[PDB]
Amino acid sequence: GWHLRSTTKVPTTMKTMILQSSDPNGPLSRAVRNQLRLNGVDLIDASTLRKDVPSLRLDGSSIQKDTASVFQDGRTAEYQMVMTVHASVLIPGHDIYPITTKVYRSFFDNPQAALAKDAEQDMIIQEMYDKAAEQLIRKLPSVQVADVEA
Amino acid sequence: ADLATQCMLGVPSYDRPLVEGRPGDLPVTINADHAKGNYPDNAVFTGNVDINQGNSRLRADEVQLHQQQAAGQAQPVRTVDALGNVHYDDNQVILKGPKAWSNLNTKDTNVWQGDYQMVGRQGRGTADLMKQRGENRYTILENGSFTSCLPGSDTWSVVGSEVIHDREEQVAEIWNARFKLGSVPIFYSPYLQLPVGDKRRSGFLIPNAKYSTKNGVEFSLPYYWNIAPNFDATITPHYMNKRGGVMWENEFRYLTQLGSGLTEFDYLPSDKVYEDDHSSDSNSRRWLFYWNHSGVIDQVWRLNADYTKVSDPDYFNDFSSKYGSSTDGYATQKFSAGYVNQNFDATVSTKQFQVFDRESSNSYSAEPQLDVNYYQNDVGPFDTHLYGQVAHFVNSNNNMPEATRVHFEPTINLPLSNGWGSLNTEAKLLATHYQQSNLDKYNAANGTDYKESVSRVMPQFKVDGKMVFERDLQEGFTQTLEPRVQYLYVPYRDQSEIGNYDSTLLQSDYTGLFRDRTYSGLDRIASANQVTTGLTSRVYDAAAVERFNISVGQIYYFTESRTGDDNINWENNDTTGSLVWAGDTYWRIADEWGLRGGIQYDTRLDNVATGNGTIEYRRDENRLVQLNYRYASPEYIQATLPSYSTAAQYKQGISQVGMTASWPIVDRWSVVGAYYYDTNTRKAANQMLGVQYNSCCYAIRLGYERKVNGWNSNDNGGESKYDNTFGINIELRGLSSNYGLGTQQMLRSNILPYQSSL
Ligand SMILES: CCCCCCCCOCCOCCOCCOCCO
Numbered sequence: 001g002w003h004l005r006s007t008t009k010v011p012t013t014m015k016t017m018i019l020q021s022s023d024p025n026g027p028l029s030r031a032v033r034n035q036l037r038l039n040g041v042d043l044i045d046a047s048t049l050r051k052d053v054p055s056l057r058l059d060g061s062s063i064q065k066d067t068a069s070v071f072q073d074g075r076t077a078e079y080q081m082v083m084t085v086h087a088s089v090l091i092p093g094h095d096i097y098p099i100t101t102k103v104y105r106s107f108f109d110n111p112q113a114a115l116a117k118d119a120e121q122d123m124i125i126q127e128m129y130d131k132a133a134e135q136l137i138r139k140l141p142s143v144q145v146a147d148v149e150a
Numbered sequence: 151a152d153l154a155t156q157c158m159l160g161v162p163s164y165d166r167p168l169v170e171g172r173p174g175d176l177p178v179t180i181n182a183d184h185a186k187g188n189y190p191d192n193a194v195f196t197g198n199v200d201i202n203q204g205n206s207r208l209r210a211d212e213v214q215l216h217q218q219q220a221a222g223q224a225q226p227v228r229t230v231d232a233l234g235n236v237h238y239d240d241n242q243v244i245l246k247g248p249k250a251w252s253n254l255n256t257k258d259t260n261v262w263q264g265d266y267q268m269v270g271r272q273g274r275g276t277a278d279l280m281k282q283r284g285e286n287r288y289t290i291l292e293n294g295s296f297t298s299c300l301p302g303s304d305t306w307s308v309v310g311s312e313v314i315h316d317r318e319e320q321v322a323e324i325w326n327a328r329f330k331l332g333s334v335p336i337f338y339s340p341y342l343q344l345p346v347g348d349k350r351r352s353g354f355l356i357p358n359a360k361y362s363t364k365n366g367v368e369f370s371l372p373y374y375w376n377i378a379p380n381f382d383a384t385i386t387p388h389y390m391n392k393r394g395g396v397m398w399e400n401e402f403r404y405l406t407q408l409g410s411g412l413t414e415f416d417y418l419p420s421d422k423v424y425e426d427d428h429s430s431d432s433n434s435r436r437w438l439f440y441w442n443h444s445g446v447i448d449q450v451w452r453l454n455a456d457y458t459k460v461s462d463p464d465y466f467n468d469f470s471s472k473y474g475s476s477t478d479g480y481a482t483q484k485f486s487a488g489y490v491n492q493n494f495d496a497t498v499s500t501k502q503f504q505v506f507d508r509e510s511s512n513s514y515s516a517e518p519q520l521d522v523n524y525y526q527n528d529v530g531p532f533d534t535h536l537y538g539q540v541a542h543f544v545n546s547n548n549n550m551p552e553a554t555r556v557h558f559e560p561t562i563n564l565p566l567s568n569g570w571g572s573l574n575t576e577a578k579l580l581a582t583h584y585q586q587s588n589l590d591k592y593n594a595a596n597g598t599d600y601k602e603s604v605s606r607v608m609p610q611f612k613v614d615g616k617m618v619f620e621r622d623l624q625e626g627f628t629q630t631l632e633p634r635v636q637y638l639y640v641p642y643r644d645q646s647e648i649g650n651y652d653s654t655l656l657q658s659d660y661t662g663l664f665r666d667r668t669y670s671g672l673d674r675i676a677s678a679n680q681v682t683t684g685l686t687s688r689v690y691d692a693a694a695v696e697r698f699n700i701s702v703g704q705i706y707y708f709t710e711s712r713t714g715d716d717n718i719n720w721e722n723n724d725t726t727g728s729l730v731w732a733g734d735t736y737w738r739i740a741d742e743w744g745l746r747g748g749i750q751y752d753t754r755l756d757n758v759a760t761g762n763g764t765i766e767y768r769r770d771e772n773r774l775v776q777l778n779y780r781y782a783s784p785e786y787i788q789a790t791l792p793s794y795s796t797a798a799q800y801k802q803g804i805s806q807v808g809m810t811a812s813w814p815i816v817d818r819w820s821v822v823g824a825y826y827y828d829t830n831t832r833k834a835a836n837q838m839l840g841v842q843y844n845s846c847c848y849a850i851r852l853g854y855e856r857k858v859n860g861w862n863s864n865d866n867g868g869e870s871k872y873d874n875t876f877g878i879n880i881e882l883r884g885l886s887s888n889y890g891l892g893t894q895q896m897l898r899s900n901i902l903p904y905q906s907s908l
């Protein structure tokens with residue numbers, strides 16, 4: 001019988017936010033703005049007044065695919081993928097706040113049906129983007145509580 | 151540390167006011183004890199003579215000013231001579247010499263038999279003639295000896311008859327150059343170039359040495375050619391002993407508005423080892439063509455390219471590069487071009503492969519492959535999506551059947567949210583058409599019944615929902631609980647008349663449990679009738695930062711997932727019940743340290759499918775340690791990968807522990823270690839030991855790498871082939887600087903690289 005609504009209610013200061021990125025048509029950007037749409041956040045362009053409204057700038061993403069393990073013949077057993085995403089919260093008059101997130105997954109490799117393993121891989125990537133966006137949203141209250149007087 | 155500061159200790163700091171411009175028109179202040187003769191003609195100062203002019207600070211024992219006519223037009227030939235004990239100093243370089251001369255109009259200064267030392271930056275030496283000509287731009291040195299490392303030990307020095315240091319062009323040209331490692335010379339050249347700047351190199355040529363077990367003594371001397379400030383080429387003669395010949399490696403980086411890209415082309419004319427191993431033909435040439443490209447035109451156009459082609463399937467096994475390794479089982483040849491806007495995106499691509507095997511390369515290829523997505527996020531309370539695909543599949547072997555697939559998939563979604571949780575109802579349709587050909591030949595061999603005109607229509611009903619609860623903890627910490635459930639239903643369709651082109655089994659991550667797909671691609675779709683239940687408990691601190699998290703999932707089946715061709719080799723015959731289980735976890739503890747875990751278990755295998763766990767002590771930038779572990783049961787390999795379980799090397803599955811050590815012993819030497827060890831066959835699969843010597847002006851690194859490469863046939867069942875590799879690399883640096891270290895660079899180089907798992 002404990003109190004509900006947690007992870008800090010998405011800051012009413014940032015109930016309406018502007019999304020900035022180098023590539024707004026990229027997978028990361030679209031996953032982010034969709035994840036924002038999911039949490040009931042209003043997205044407005046930077047063509048208005050923009051005085052009290054903060055913004056979310058996407059620095060850049062980077063996916064790393066290395067060999068996690070191998071068999072007894074030296075060939076790859078499974079690949080481990082690491083999606084690194086850099087971002088920054090810009091509040092008018094409150095400087096900036098960097099947000100670095102990383103997504104970790106892995107999957108077995110099958111040369112014979114590489115094509116299949118390609119498609120699968122792509123799918124994984126997609127999911128890894130989505131989860132990344134989630135990991136970006138959950139780290140917002142830290143930026144909110146970062147706003148202290150000193 | 152900040153070694154740069156340590157190297158700036160011997161280097162002067164220079165105080166004094168910085169004057170903007172040139173000290174040519176500026177007046178000349180002369181302060182001494184002694185001063186005889188005609189001031190504008192023949193002036194003679196003596197006794198601690200101090201002469202200042204803007205940035206020109208000169209101090210001597212005796213200074214003489216001797217002039218010429220300079221009549222008519224216009225200026226005076228202001229010619230300043232200097233007899234003895236000349237100590238010159240400015241904002242750039244300190245000069246010390248016996249006899250000196252200087253013209254202050256053109257700012258041309260000469261010093262005979264003197265020593266010099268740069269200010270603000272490293273660089274000293276001794277020359278018979280030190281000159282600053284061309285308005286203090288060109289620094290000429292006749293009979294000069296130059297070195298960067300100032301005191302302690304005469305570790306290296308370059309001597310030359312005619313050296314020239316250009317400041318604007320930023321370059322150190324040397325005529326009759328002789329390089330010395332102290333007092334012992336090695337190389338002599340009619341002419342050399344040592345760059346001071348950055349962009350646009352064309353630097354002389356820096357080589358590197360290696361010693362592998364397969365190639366023997368390796369010696370690379372890579373040429374570098376910079377064409378334009380956007381694209382350049384990099385040739386590389388790579389002498390190999392056991393191979394007996396020079397391998398030419400042609401690199402080519404480019405950057406245009408259509409995007410960036412890289413083009414590699416390695417080539418070896420004759421190989422003795424490959425000729426002896428394969429004497430079926432006289433042709434023994436081995437090459438590698440690589441081409442990558444990434445471009446985003448006007449934010450809407452996307453041009454990507456990943457092409458990798460080799461000559462022989464045993465290329466990467468022998469030769470190692472930044473483009474492939476012995477772990478690679480095939481080569482990827484994909485070209486992608488797409489228009490992605492916002493609510494709509496159409497990407498067409500061609501996918502081809504190159505399986506690295508002597509006789510089992512029956513891999514398919516899409517030619518082409520068209521994908522189309524069209525979204526509509528607001529239809530009242532609904533949001534709709536439209537997916538479409540047209541893919542023509544062919545095969546390298548003409549025995550395998552060809553196909554033409556037209557897939558259509560509309561997805562109607564309905565999101566609902568209030569506060570404490572949310573529920574999303576998704577209704578999807580999966581229509582598919584197949585036009586297959588060349589079936590009669592494959593209709594034999596095995597039990598197959600593929601027809602030319604095939605169709606498949608499968609509806610899909612999904613209901614997702616998750617809640618959020620809060621429990622307060624101690625000293626500001628806040629715990630939360632996230633229960634999630636998702637039901638899925640798809641009717642059964644007999645797909646025995648449909649071939650497999652892009653379908654394989656997947657891995658069940660905690661998030662993967664909520665995936666509405668059993669196979670990859672759109673060939674084999676399972677008859678869904680399941681309910682997925684999972685719990686996600688998270689632990690935050692007072693700073694609203696996620697420090698801990700744990701998830702556990704369970705999939706319940708009402709009926710078994712059938713496709714119409716389920717030839718999966720399971721251990722038991724369990725059809726219904728909670729078959730699939732998962733569990734992930736993540737720990738952060740403090741600013742350093744950490745933990746990660748992921749476990750996948752299946753009841754049909756009667757054993758855990760996968761199990762990975764990685765712990766890591768990471769500081770912040772460098773010097774860190776990692777310990778990992780991965781496990782994949784033999785049953786998992788037997789079920790997921792048929793025919794592989796028949797072999798002895800893929801039978802036991804996976805059970806390896808990974809080690810990565812990187813902690814500096816001395817504040818100069820960089821110690822690097824790594825150790826990947828298998829527990830099933832109790833044999834070390836991989837191990838690396840590397841060291842480095844970072845002085846201040848140069849650096850030599852020695853790397854050792856023992857790794858598993860190939861499988862040895864015959865014998866008493868067979869064993870793993872081991873290969874050792876030594877590597878001697880030398881980098882000068884310290885000039886343009888921003889180098890040295892290696893930090894973790896040496897870690898990522900093995901067949902099993904070190905990844906940052908926090
Ligand atoms: C025992 C006292 C120290 C002896 C000399 C101190 C007084 C300094 O007077 C030196 C006079 O010479 C000044 C030369 O002026 C150079 C600049 O003007 C020449 C052209 O503008």
Ligand SMILES: CCCCCCCCOCCOCCOCCOCCO
Pocket residue numbers: 348349379380381405
């Ligand atoms: C990272 C390479 C090692 C560092 C030394 C070389 C300098 C790095 O840049 C060289 C390659 O980058 C190409 C420069 O970008 C193009 C600039 O002009 C394009 C505008 O039209």
